[PDB]
Design a binder for this molecule. Structure first.
Ligand SMILES: Nc1nc2c(ncn2[C@@H]2O[C@H](COP(=O)(O)OP(=O)(O)OP(=O)(O)O)[C@@H](O)[C@H]2O)c(=O)[nH]1
Ligand SMILES: [Mg+2]
Ligand SMILES: [Mg+2]
Ligand SMILES: [Mg+2]
Ligand SMILES: [Zn+2]
Lengths: 83, 67, 96, 456, 202, 49, 27, 93, 48, 115
RNA sequence: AUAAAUUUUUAAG
RNA sequence: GGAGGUCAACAUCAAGAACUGUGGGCCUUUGCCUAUAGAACUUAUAACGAACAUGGUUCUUGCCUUUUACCAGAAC
């Protein structure tokens, strides 16, 4: 939520979440669960701008494998169900 | 090579009770768990190297000191 | 006797060894009347002594207590920073 | 960079150490960061602290070689209580992100403009509002008034750089013209974040005199006018800068008042004296004592009081803070059954605890600091101290103590209590705090010192 | 600075047994004997040679009134500054003196006091190669630990007669407080335990 | 492997992502150099003052 | 323990010289 | 601790006594490529064996090394326990 | 010390340090930072 | 005896308001307090020309000089002061007026202004 | 698997 | 004559691990060699004090308008 106020993405929050992941698996579970919570429940609120922050912020997490990658499976593309 | 600091580690960690002595008589020797010639060994760069290769480390170093 | 001998009669000492002017001073007074760290330092020092000797006095008078005494001179010896002002004329005392 | 972090720290700590010399101190306890970092609109200096952070300390010998990373953090700057403070570099977007945004934005504006041209429409000026502040040329600059002239201004950068040579005063921003480049940054968010980083207006003003002026709410305070004069500053923050937790300093009671000074603060004496003049302290004391003597006069009926007589007070007792003596004394028509001592607001009392005849009152004024602004504790401390003591004289070993902070305009009373008093003293005091002419003479005069108007 | 050592002819202590008479013993080869003293850390070696010496010599300049009744043991054979501050013994140091046996015949003896730290075994090898017999000095409390085993194996390896000393008996009662019986049991356990590693003798 | 230079007050160490032998996500004081066409990031530019 | 991190001493550095291990980067 | 500008985690902090470390000859000797990192070399080593682990000491003193490892055992609990008694802490022999 | 000996000589009243043995020993644990700082301070004076 | 002095020793009794009354009575009998006159060190803003020795006070010169509260009061209430300055060459007193309505001074009795 | 804590004031000009 | 004294004076207390006297031989008294007698107090994780202050000069810093007063290390 704070990262969405910054008006532009910053490497700050990426390296923050990365250093926070590797310390304890509870933070693994934390970021995974929050990924599902965001993408599923909470996206409908954000304007197309803040989406530019989220997109890259999760991009840095996935591309370097911290996320991990298979957790992208939640996404499903259908005309019927998509936002 | 692992005993560089051992004694004081022990003697402090127990709050002065205890003692240690390191001595070399039987002249035992042992393999270093690495493989002496490998290109892919991981050079930790300021960390103690992982046990999979300690030998490629030690040799790649001694050869740098010698020449 | 050292104050008046110098010719200054308008600086009064109280009985706690605080040195206060009894008047507003013309300039040449302030010049004549600047007293150095010798005097003032010794003033502060006596002020300490008088202070302790007083605590024991009020013990002797019965006015205080047994234990309240010891707490008393403890309080002095720790709080001399606040109760005296010796720390002004030699700042070295700040170590103690 | 290690050295520039170290130099920011030394720099700020050095300027703070310059204001500290501005009075007399280096002392940490006198100057909690609320003093420096509260924005001017609340009366603090309003400096912008970039030096707290924590500074990577890693491995002097190796960092000459590898760039080991950050293995450790040395403490950047200090405090008594930590709190936290925001630091600028967080509130200014990094260059990367601004150039990227510049490229996407100017691409989008290229397209949209081609929409206005091809469809012969005009820019909605709302359709462009989303990106209005994005881009290194800062789209807003398109629409400034003077653009027709500015297109004939070229070579502005090199001119800016050679302004070094033709005039003395530096121009700290030599790399932009706010005309051509717009405005590349903003802060004001930082402002609010500091105010709530210190605990908000409610905790901040605990440090000031704001409660002494009598104003109930902050919002209506205009100050007076952007530079705060130095005197007005030391008054405004005085109950911190002067405080009883001071490490070393020499207690000196002011001339005719009961204020204590720790050490020597240069301005605080002149400002405080010019608040308390014409022996205003005595006038306060005798004012309150007198009015309580009237309210006791009217009530002789219910309380069975032979005589309410304010004694003849030794002239100095008002501002003598060591030992006090009874101002108003009481007398029993029939006789009185009093209770064990309590606070003013403690409800349950068994009035059959004691039986006495004479009661006495005291009014003990005190000008409080941010260390101890709590009264009731002070009042019970006094009352117990004296009533237990042999020296302090009272017509009977039963009485009531009435304390007041004139700095925070607060009060309380820790007495012995028999039926009928508390319902009197509560209401009556609640009037007196807003009543007496004297206390009103303060509350105007402090307003003269701090230069405050209540608008609206 | 470097060591602590006495340089004059007139300050050498006075040897109540008449040194001149000792040097005469040197003519008789059978008479003089070489004993080294070896044993693990803080077994009391050097402070034992102290007992021998200050028994022999009449007046030693190195005695403070303190160490003479000493709370702090006088350590005569220490001799190096580094070994004084380090608290340890480093370079081996001996002495030569004649002493009367229990039958009152006097014999000349060369003690070689070796260091006791197991990194300095290099200089116990010297004490073996020189000395004719070895006193192996043992702590009753510490018992015989592995280094003692190596001292008796090196002794019996070099064909050098052995004698054991059980030192630090004060630490037994005055600290551990063992009942009179239990101490004796402990001695049976040690003396029983050392014979185990001496194959040809008991 | 490095290519150093400095302009204005910025000092820049350019490492091509090739020869870094490892690619680690790094803080915001470090630029990513993006090719025109491939849209990749081939080099990190480390910045100091 | 002072391992070679920190300052030669905290006098002119105006800080408290308080150093603490970084929980951030370890593995 | 002072001469080497080192601290025991509970000990005092002093001044350098040799304020200039800044001089460094760029040379092959101590280069990383030539060093093997095993064990961190904590300070307590450098205070313990000052001449060994610590390159270029000055005005350093000899630490005194070791003592006998006191086994002392006493009873403050019962006054009527005897003076000589076999304490359960000891081994059974 | 004064205890093991059982004999000795008088020492001037201000020469018996009662509080030295407390700060020569380790700081312990539960103590807040404020007193640990004091142990360091006193040890510094002693060493000097 | 410090230039910045926090306290002043008072006699042990000293009813302060009583001293305000008795001192208020004392204020009439003294010569200095009642002088109706004043002495101030000041400057000459508009320069000068002396009308006796025709000496020139060139632009702005320190003087020990004399301020007087004027019986006039500008408008309904504004204070207006009259200053006097002695000439260096000759003994002569020149006076000022301060016009609050017209910020600049206007002067009289013994001097003229340069244009 | 961390337990690492600088200060602090008076006079004169 | 013994015990003492909150009595005094005069010696001595930091060094070749170290004191003093004396006998004998050589040089020519000193000094070297040899022989002999007596060595209180203080010293080895070094010192008269199982404790612990200040000052002067000279450098290095730290505060930072200047001087006292100072910040913390070193040598004498
Ligand atoms: N209880 C007790 N302790 C002793 C005895 N003898 C020596 N010690 C202690 O043990 C330590 C060792 O004594 P030393 O003889 O000086 O040490 P060492 O024998 O030289 O030890 P090395 O230097 O290795 O030869 C000393 O610090 C003594 O205090 C003893 O007879 N009884
Ligand atoms: Mg030994
Ligand atoms: Mg002047
Ligand atoms: Mg001058
Ligand atoms: Zn004239």
């Amino acid at each position: 939520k704070s990262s969405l106020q910054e008006s532009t993405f910053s490497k700050f929050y990426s390296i923050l979440s990365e250093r926070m992941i590797t310390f304890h698996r509870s933070w693994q579970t934390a970021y995974n669960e929050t990924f599902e919570q965001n993408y599923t429940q909470d996206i409908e609120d954000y304007e197309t701008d803040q989406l530019r922050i989220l997109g890259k912020f999760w991009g840095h997490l996935i591309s370097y494998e911290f996320l991990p990658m298979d957790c992208l499976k939640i996404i499903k593309l259908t005309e019927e169900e998509s936002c | 090579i692992e005993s560089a600091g051992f004694e004081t580690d022990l003697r402090l960690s127990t709050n002065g009770l205890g003692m240690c002595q390191l001595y070399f008589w039987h002249k035992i020797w042992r393999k270093v768990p690495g493989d002496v010639l490998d290109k892919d060994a991981f050079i930790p760069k300021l960390k103690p190297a992982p046990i999979n290769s300690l030998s490629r480390d030690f040799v790649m170093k001694t050869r740098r000191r010698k020449g | 006797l050292l104050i008046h001998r110098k010719g200054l009669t308008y600086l009064h000492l109280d009985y706690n060894f605080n040195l206060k002017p009894t008047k507003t001073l013309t300039t040449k007074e302030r010049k004549k009347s600047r007293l150095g760290n010798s005097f003032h330092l010794m003033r502060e020092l006596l002020k300490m002594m008088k202070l302790i000797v007083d605590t024991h006095v009020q013990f002797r008078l019965g006015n205080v207590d047994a234990f309240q005494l010891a707490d008393g001179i403890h309080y002095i010896l720790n709080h001399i920073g606040q109760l005296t002002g010796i720390y002004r004329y030699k700042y070295k005392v700040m170590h103690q | 960079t290690e050295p520039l972090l170290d130099i920011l720290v030394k720099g700020e700590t050095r300027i703070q150490n310059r204001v500290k010399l501005g009075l007399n101190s280096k002392m940490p306890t006198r100057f909690p960061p609320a003093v420096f970092y509260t924005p001017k609109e609340l009366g603090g200096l309003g400096m912008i602290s970039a030096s707290h952070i924590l500074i990577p300390a890693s491995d002097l010998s190796w960092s000459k070689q590898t760039d080991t990373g950050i293995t450790h953090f040395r403490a950047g700057m200090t405090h008594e209580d930590e709190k936290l403070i925001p630091t600028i570099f967080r509130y200014i977007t990094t260059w990367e992100n601004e150039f990227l945004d510049s490229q996407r934005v100017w691409a989008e504006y290229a397209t949209k403009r081609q929409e206005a041209i091809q469809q012969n429409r005009r820019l909605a000026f709302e359709e462009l509002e989303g990106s209005w502040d994005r881009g290194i040329p800062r789209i807003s600059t398109l629409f400034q008034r003077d653009r027709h002239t500015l297109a004939y201004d070229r070579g502005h950068r090199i001119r800016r750089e050679f302004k070094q040579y033709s005039l003395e005063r530096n121009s700290p921003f030599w790399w932009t013209n706010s005309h051509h480049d717009g405005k590349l940054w903003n802060l004001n968010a930082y402002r609010t974040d500091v105010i709530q980083a210190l605990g908000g207006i409610e905790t901040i003003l605990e440090h000031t005199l704001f409660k002494g002026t009598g104003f109930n709410s902050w919002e209506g305070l205009f100050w007076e006018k952007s530079q705060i004069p130095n005197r007005r500053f030391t008054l405004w923050w005085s109950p911190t800068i002067n405080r009883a937790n001071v490490y070393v300093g020499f207690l000196v009671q002011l001339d005719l008042t009961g204020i204590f000074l720790h050490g020597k603060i240069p301005t605080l004496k002149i400002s405080l004296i010019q608040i308390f003049r014409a022996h205003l302290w005595q006038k306060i004391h005798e004012s309150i004592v007198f009015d309580i003597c009237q309210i006791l006069d009217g009530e002789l009926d219910v309380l069975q009081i032979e005589s309410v007589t304010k004694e003849t007070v030794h002239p100095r007792k008002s501002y003598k803070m060591n030992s006090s003596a009874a101002d108003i004394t009481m007398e029993s028509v029939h006789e009185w059954e009093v209770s064990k001592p309590s606070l003013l607001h403690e409800t349950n009392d068994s009035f059959k605890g004691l039986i006495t005849n004479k009661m006495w009152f005291d009014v003990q004024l005190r000008y409080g600091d941010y260390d101890s602004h709590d009264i009731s504790r002070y009042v019970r401390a006094k009352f117990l101290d004296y009533t237990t003591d042999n020296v302090s004289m009272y017509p009977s070993p039963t009485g009531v103590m009435i304390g007041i902070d004139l700095a925070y305009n607060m009060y309380d009373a820790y007495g012995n209590w028999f039926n009928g008093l508390k319902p009197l003293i509560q209401n009556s005091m609640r009037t007196i705090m807003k009543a007496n002419p004297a206390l009103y003479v303060l509350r105007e005069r402090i307003r003269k010192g701090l230069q405050i108007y209540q608008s609206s | 600075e470097h060591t602590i050592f006495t340089q004059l002819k007139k300050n050498i202590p006075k040897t109540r047994y008449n040194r001149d008479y000792m040097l005469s013993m040197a003519n008789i080869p059978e008479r003089i004997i070489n004993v080294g003293v070896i044993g693990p850390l803080h077994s009391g070696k050097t402070s034992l040679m102290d007992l021998l010496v200050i028994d022999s010599h009449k007046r030693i300049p190195d005695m403070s009134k303190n160490v003479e009744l000493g709370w702090k043991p006088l350590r005569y054979l220490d001799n190096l500054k580094q070994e004084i501050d380090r608290g340890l013994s480093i370079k081996l140091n001996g002495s030569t003196l004649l002493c009367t046996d229990l039958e009152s015949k006097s014999r000349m003896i060369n003690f070689l006091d070796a260091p006791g730290h197991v990194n300095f075994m290099d200089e116990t090898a010297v004490a073996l190669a020189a000395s004719d017999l070895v006193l192996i000095v043992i702590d009753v409390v510490e018992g015989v630990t592995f280094v003692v085993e190596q001292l008796i194996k090196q002794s019996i390896k070099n064909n050098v007669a052995m004698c054991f000393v059980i030192n630090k008996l004060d630490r037994l009662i005055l600290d551990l407080k063992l009942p009179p019986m239990d101490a004796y049991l402990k001695l049976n356990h040690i003396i029983a335990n050392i014979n185990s590693f001496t194959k040809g003798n008991v | 492997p490095n290519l150093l230079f400095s302009m204005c007050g910025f000092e820049v160490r350019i490492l091509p992502r090739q020869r870094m032998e490892e690619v680690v996500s790094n803080d915001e004081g470090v630029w990513d150099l993006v090719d025109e066409r491939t849209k990749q990031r081939t080099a990190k530019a480390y910045l100091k003052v | 323990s002072y391992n070679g991190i920190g300052l030669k001493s905290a006098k002119g550095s105006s800080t408290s010289g308080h150093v603490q291990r970084s929980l951030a980067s370890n593995n | 601790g002072k001469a080497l500008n080192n601290a025991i985690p509970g000990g005092p902090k002093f001044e350098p006594l040799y304020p200039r470390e800044e001089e460094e000859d760029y040379n092959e000797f101590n280069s990383i490529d030539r060093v093997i990192f095993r064990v961190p070399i904590r300070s307590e080593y450098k205070v313990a064996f000052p001449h060994l682990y610590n390159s270029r000491p000055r005005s350093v003193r000899i630490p005194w090394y070791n003592n006998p490892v006191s086994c002392i055992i006493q009873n403050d609990e019962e006054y009527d326990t005897p003076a000589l008694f076999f304490d359960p802490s000891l081994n059974p022999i | 010390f004064p205890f093991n000996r059982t004999k000795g000589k008088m020492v001037r009243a201000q020469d018996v340090a009662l509080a030295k043995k407390w700060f020569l020993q380790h700081p312990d644990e539960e103590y807040p930072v404020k007193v640990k700082v004091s142990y360091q301070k006193l040890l510094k004076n002693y060493v000097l | 005896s410090e230039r910045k002095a926090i306290n002043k020793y008072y006699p042990p009794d000293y009813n302060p308001l009583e001293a305000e009354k008795l001192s208020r009575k004392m204020a009439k009998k003294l010569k200095t307090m009642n002088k109706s006159h004043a002495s101030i060190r000041l400057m000459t803003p508009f320069s000068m020309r002396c009308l006796e020795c025709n000496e020139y006070i060139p632009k702005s010169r320190k003087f020990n000089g004399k301020k007087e509260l004027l019986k006039e009061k500008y408008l309904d209430s504004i204070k207006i002061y009259r200053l006097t300055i002695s000439c260096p060459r000759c003994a002569n007193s020149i006076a000022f007026r301060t016009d609050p309505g017209n910020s600049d001074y206007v002067m009289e009795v013994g001097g003229v202004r340069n244009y």
